[PDB]
Amino acid sequence: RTVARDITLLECVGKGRYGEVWRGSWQGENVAVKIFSSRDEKSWFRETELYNTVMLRHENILGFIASDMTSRHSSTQLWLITHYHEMGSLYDYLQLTTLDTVSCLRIVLSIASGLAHLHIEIFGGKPAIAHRDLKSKNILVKKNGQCCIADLGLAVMHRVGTKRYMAPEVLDETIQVDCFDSYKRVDIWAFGLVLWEVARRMVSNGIVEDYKPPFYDVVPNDPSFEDMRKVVCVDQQRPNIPNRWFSDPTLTSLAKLMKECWYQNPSARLTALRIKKTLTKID
Ligand SMILES: COc1cc(-c2cncc(-c3ccc(C4CCN(C)CC4)cc3)c2C)cc(OC)c1OC
Ligand SMILES: COc1cc(-c2cncc(-c3ccc(C4CCN(C)CC4)cc3)c2C)cc(OC)c1OC
Ligand SMILES: COc1cc(-c2cncc(-c3ccc(C4CCN(C)CC4)cc3)c2C)cc(OC)c1OC
Known part of the structure; x- marks a missing residue:
């Protein structure tokens, strides 16, 4: 089967010491993509460890979609993908x-x-x-x-x-x-x-x-x-x-x-x- 992983990053909706948040598109649907700074990599680890322990699902908790770690030439790229709230x-x-x-x-x-x-x-x-x-x-x-x-x-x-x-x-x-x-x-x-x-x-x-x-x-x-x-x-x-x-x-x-x-x-x-x-x- 085809595992479609491409996310189109359309606009930056937040930039800080944490990194950036982007509005993205996956398979025609809006997602939010948090791209972590090196400064804040432990926040990606902790949220990922929590969701690997318990897949929280509640109307009043931001909805988890994915945690992605991608190898780069000389760095690791960490994304958290969630529901998007316009x-x-x-x-x-x-x-x-x-x-x-x-x-x-x-x-x-x-x-x-x-x-x-x-x-x-x-x-x-x-x-x-x-x-x-x-x-x-x-x-x-x-x-x-x-x-x-x-x-x-x-x-x-x-x-x-x-x-x-x-x-x-x-x-x-x-x-x-x-x-x-x-x-x-x-x-x-x-x-x-x-x-x-x-x-x-x-x-x-x-x-x-x-x-x-x-x-x-x-x-x-x-x-x-x-x-x-x-x-x-x-x-x-x-x-x-x-x-x-x-x-x-x-x-x-x-x-x-x-x-x-x-x-x-x-x-x-x-x-x-x-x-x-x-x-x-x-x-
Ligand atoms: C790896 O990475 C990403 C993957 C995806 C994604 C894309 N298509 C299909 C899937 C899928 C889901 C679940 C199954 C199940 C089917 C039932 N069977 C009993 C076990 C397996 C298969 C396939 C996924 C998870 C999206 C991503 O981003 C939105 C990914 O990157 C974070
Ligand atoms: C990560 O996120 C998204 C993923 C998907 C997605 C894509 N391919 C396949 C699936 C899937 C199919 C089937 C099972 C099985 C599990 C065991 N049992 C045998 C019955 C059910 C699980 C998973 C999903 C959920 C779609 C999404 O949105 C439409 C996602 O959200 C962005
Ligand atoms: C707090 O934290 C996280 C938040 C989010 C998140 C989810 N939906 C939507 C947003 C967002 C969208 C749009 C605007 C603007 C742009 C248009 N207009 C001019 C005013 C409104 C602001 C914010 C965010 C930032 C995702 C996260 O992770 C992926 C977060 O981190 C866990």
Whole structure:
């Protein structure tokens, strides 16, 4: 039989220290192709090792297609091939889109659904998985209004995370590194920050906040480890909840939920399954 492996690379949709992401075409269908830098080869290995262990399949997890290693004259080329989401990342989408109640809840419940699926151990199934780099750039928007979680290059089964989204116990190096629940709790902190980023873009009473990243008002761009530790650990700052949210029942409920993802004590934070239940009872 013919094994068609040619992918046409049509446009670059992302370029970074990680390498590049391309929109590609295989057999007439769009695919996304991540081409890894030498800097980030271990992220290709880790995601590939995870998918060789457990073939994750969930509506709110970016869909795996292939891991390719190709020998070159003097280098190895590493590609990860996934489903393609033409609307791009949640980070992108929130810059120039505002949300209503239904769209805001659909987005955040779909993220919670993907995250709970990663976190849960299923027997007979999947190992429990923590993401370790959850953020709005690592979430893609689908045409049906749900999102999917991407980038399992730092994931752990039972490179450091983006500093702006690191939990206090990562910044103060008290995290219990031998305890898998510790990594779930780090993802929940980051989820709370994503929930704040999305909620700001939900309109109520004709008001909306501009898109801003978490801690935009207290750290520089590309904040250092120390910059983040002083904000999150020493001063114990948390993102601002605007007064206008307290006129709106949905944003009032989402403020409470994000507070319960941001406790200093990791074991006080809500679980992804409890976040899902709370979100299903809003509106
Ligand atoms: C090697 O590399 C790539 C391969 C492919 C690809 C292309 N055509 C057909 C296939 C195929 C799938 C599955 C079987 C099964 C049939 C049932 N039988 C019991 C066992 C074998 C055979 C063939 C593949 C996997 C695409 C690629 O990119 C999209 C590849 O590069 C990453
Ligand atoms: C990697 O990705 C894609 C792959 C393919 C593809 C191409 N040739 C053959 C297959 C295949 C056929 C048959 C089995 C068997 C397995 C055992 N049992 C006996 C029943 C079923 C498995 C695999 C596939 C899945 C198509 C795709 O899209 C249309 C892919 O997605 C981009
Ligand atoms: C986060 O991480 C990964 C993401 C992806 C991925 C999947 N679908 C679509 C995209 C994408 C497409 C298009 C735009 C732009 C272009 C057109 N318009 C002007 C605005 C929107 C942005 C983004 C990506 C980047 C794949 C990955 O791996 C193959 C990723 O890594 C795991």
